[PDB]
Design a protein around this nucleic acid. Structure first.
Length: 109
RNA sequence: GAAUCUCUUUGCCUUUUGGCUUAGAUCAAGUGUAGUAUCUGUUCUGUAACAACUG
């Protein structure tokens, strides 16, 4: 039961990629560490981890080289920075410019 | 020596590039229907002689 701190969605689980969270009653709420292990986990309105400690990936390797030791790097994608003035953050694309052109001309595929 | 025809190099070029400026400048991603162009395929393969008249 360990967790990896992702910048966009907060925390991913090592098993299955479940978006979890730190409970505010814990000691580690206002602070952040990158790799943490959690004693318990509760499904509610939001996930919550309980008894969370900082951990280093050297320890997670030297203890368990049998549970584990790319493809997720290949399947990833990125999206640009968000602006308020654009009103649809896909309209910069060449596909969306093509679609807006062919809609204004009035053709249909 | 000289004429006629015909072929090689050698001359001739004889349908043998007729202005300028910011290369004068920009850009070639639309649907249907229609016109024009072209391009692939298949099969099959009366005449002569004799007898008579010259009108």
């Amino acid at each position: 039961n360990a967790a990896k701190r992702d910048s966009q969605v907060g925390y991913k689980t090592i098993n299955g990629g479940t978006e979890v969270g730190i409970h505010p009653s814990s000691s580690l709420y206002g602070k952040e560490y990158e790799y943490v292990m959690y004693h318990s986990i509760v499904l509610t309105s939001r996930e919550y981890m309980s008894q969370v400690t900082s951990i280093e990936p050297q320890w997670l390797l030297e203890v368990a080289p049998h549970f584990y030791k790319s493809q997720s790097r290949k399947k990833a994608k990125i999206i640009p920075l968000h602006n308020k003035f654009a009103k649809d953050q896909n309209s910069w694309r060449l596909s969306s410019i093509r679609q807006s052109r062919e809609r204004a001309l009035g053709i249909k595929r």
